[PDB]
């Protein structure tokens, strides 16, 4: 009994690795000329119904918390936003001393020091002449220096460019596809807790419609889980790691800005146009959001029940409002129609659970300028949007951070906190992993190469 060795080319075997992915966007919107962020004009068109083919008798293990696509995706967004603001105009000439005063057009009692009516000198198209123009700025964009003498809050740290009106901030689905020689797996187990072997793993050349949203807590428009609201974590015993709760039935949230804002164009220089708020038409009403009272209470019921499986059954689980700190972590900030919101969420995470119609209204605040999460220094200016802004969205998951209490006092308090922007994408890239195909295996057989 003598047998020899052979080499088999094109043999199916894979190794965990990482590489650089590329575009995959729908071609339906290509005709709609939009040179916006997350571009479609410069990309490989996607493929209809990619070759998603099932696999059998295969066992593969996944790990979100050390995944590489989430890391690479982040740099993709960071490298894109910077490129999308280069053609836009800077705001260096606007850093001027302002003469401001309160605005009272029978303003509602809800807010008093929210809108400031500022007037400042500015250079017209001709360098010699100057003009006295006025605009309305939110209270979070002006600081006092010494009376009425205000300046933009971010004119002594770093100037930043205006958001180009041509581009848009709405999320466009982006599919991810591996290059030639690679393959993207995809777990399919319903009871997949993030880590461990996935029995029914299947391969696909391109990921499903992924729409990365920019939200801190209560991430919106996510991919719903199939069943059994699932609590995904890394080290649940440790309290320093976030908990990404994803639930099946989404609760609808309606957010509106009843103020009838009007846009006004001001010529900073030759071809340099700067937009600013004009005169508010009608009464001024605070921007708020609504979530159904009945569904939300039921939704927390599922989460609490699904959470006791890790902390026992006789545990007094009670939620608490946000921790307290930076304005973008206390509230939850979400883009809506080109304007950035900041909605107080203390009305939701306020209850206690024992182991034995109406609509919730919450206030919100708006900031024209925002300290970009992409980098510490450079900010961004959001031009006002005419009319009334209203947008509905799907709240699909939560980002709960546990409280590091003592071992005794079994009342375990959970608080919400966004913090890392990566987690918003990790909640949608929890199914895919990238692998490297390695053909040219070796096996034994019987031959004799004739001479």
């Amino acid at each position, epitope marked *: 009994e003598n047998l020899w060795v052979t080499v088999y080319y094109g043999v199916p075997v894979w190794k965990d690795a990482e590489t650089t992915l590329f575009c995959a966007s729908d071609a339906k919107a290509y005709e709609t000329e939009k040179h916006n962020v997350w571009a479609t004009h410069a990309c490989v068109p996607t493929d209809p119904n990619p070759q998603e083919i099932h696999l059998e008798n295969v066992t593969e293990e996944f790990n979100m918390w050390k995944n590489n696509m989430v890391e690479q995706m982040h740099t993709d967004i960071i490298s894109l936003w910077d490129q999308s603001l280069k053609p836009c105009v800077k705001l260096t000439p606007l850093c001027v001393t302002l003469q401001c005063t309160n605005v009272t057009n029978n303003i509602t009692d809800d807010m008093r020091g929210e809108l400031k009516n500022c007037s400042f000198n500015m250079t017209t198209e001709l360098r010699d002449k100057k003009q006295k123009v006025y605009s309305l700025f939110y209270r979070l964009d002006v600081v006092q220096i010494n009376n009425k003498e205000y300046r933009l809050i971010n004119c002594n*740290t770093s100037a930043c460019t205006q958001a180009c009106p041509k581009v848009s901030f709405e999320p466009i689905p982006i599919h991810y596809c591996a290059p030639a020689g690679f393959a993207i797996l995809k777990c399919k187990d319903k009871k997949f807790n993030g880590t461990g072997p996935c029995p029914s793993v299947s391969t696909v050349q391109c990921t499903h419609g992924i729409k990365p949203v920019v939200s801190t807590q209560l991430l919106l428009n996510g991919s719903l889980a199939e069943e059994e609201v699932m609590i995904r974590s890394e080290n649940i015993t440790n309290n320093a790691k976030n908990i990404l709760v994803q639930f099946n039935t989404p609760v609808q949230i309606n957010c509106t800005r009843p103020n009838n804002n009007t846009r006004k164009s001001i010529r900073i220089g030759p071809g340099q146009a700067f937009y600013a708020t004009g005169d508010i038409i009608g009464d001024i009403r605070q921007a708020h959001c609504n979530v159904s009272k009945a569904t939300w209470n039921e939704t927390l019921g599922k989460v609490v029940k699904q959470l006791r499986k890790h902390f026992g059954n006789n545990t007094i689980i009670r939620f608490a409002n946000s921790s307290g700190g930076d304005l973008e972590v206390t509230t939850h900030s979400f883009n809506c129609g080109g304007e950035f919101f900041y909605c107080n969420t203390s009305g939701l995470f306020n209850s206690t659970w024992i182991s034995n119609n109406d609509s919730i209204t919450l206030p919100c605040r708006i900031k024209q300028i925002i300290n970009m999460w992409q980098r510490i*220094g450079q900010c961004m200016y959001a031009p006002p949007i005419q009319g009334v802004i209203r947008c509905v969205s799907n709240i699909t998951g939560l980002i709960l951070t546990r409280d590091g209490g003592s071992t005794n006092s079994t009342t375990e308090t959970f608080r919400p906190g966004g*913090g890392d922007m990566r987690d918003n994408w990790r909640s949608e890239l929890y199914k895919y992993k990238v692998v490297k195909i390695e053909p040219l295996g070796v096996a034994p057989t019987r031959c004799k190469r004739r001479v």
Partner: nanobody
Amino acid sequence: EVQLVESGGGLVQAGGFLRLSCELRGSIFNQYAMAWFRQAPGKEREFVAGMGAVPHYGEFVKGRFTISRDNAKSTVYLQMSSLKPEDTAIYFCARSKSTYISYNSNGYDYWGRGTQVTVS
């Protein structure tokens, strides 16, 4: 690898002056916000100061301190001043998960060794 180093600190006469520092070497400096926590004996950790894109201070700071981050050296300083005897504690340095600061200790994932400061 992500690691941090601290400054001297040391004993300082009551109502004196002191400066602390913390250098972030591993990760990028313009992608995270650093903050300082103090742990007095027989007490839990609490927030003192932290700089993301806008400075923040604790309840007991009362504007005495001053925090600023130098992008060139990738370090964060702390212009401690008017140290009352009650301020003695071990002052840690921590890096937040992202560019925002949370007063809860669970918002940071890379702590420092700890600088000992005493006031007499």
